[PDB]
Amino acid sequence: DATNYNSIFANRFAAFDELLSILKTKFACRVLFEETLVLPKVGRSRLHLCKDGSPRVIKAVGVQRNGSEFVLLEVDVSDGVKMLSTKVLSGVDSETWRNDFEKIRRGVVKSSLNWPNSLFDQLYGQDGHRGVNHPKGLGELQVSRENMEGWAERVVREQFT
16 A cells, blocks of 8 residues: 555654654754555565554654655554664665665565665665664653653764764
8 A cells, every 4th residue: 555644653653743743943953744554475484563453553754854854764663563773764765765665665564574674785885875773762751842842853963974
């Protein structure tokens, strides 16, 4: 399914969407697009589904800040499976994003719900993507406004490499 299911799966991305709000208000970010897509079936394993039988999804967000663009990727782990980092993609070609994103979604499922980093390297270079760790205890016990802003800082910061 290539349909954008943003609003219907928004409950699963409560924290992540609060992060988007903070980037907009305190870190001069503009959101270019938000899309929430179903993960594809690959073989007979069932990681593309949640524990409850519903589709497991992935959210992509295009962001502009300080004259540069990046794309955030966030994998739905609402059923309590091991949380993935938030991917920050840079130098993303939007003219091929539709097809590339499709490869990425398949790579996530194929990698047993992990980022397909060899694919990311091929697509954007080793320096074209990085992971950002979620705030501690995200999913169990609410996260403070302080740590939410910290999360935002970690997303937009500059890397050594």
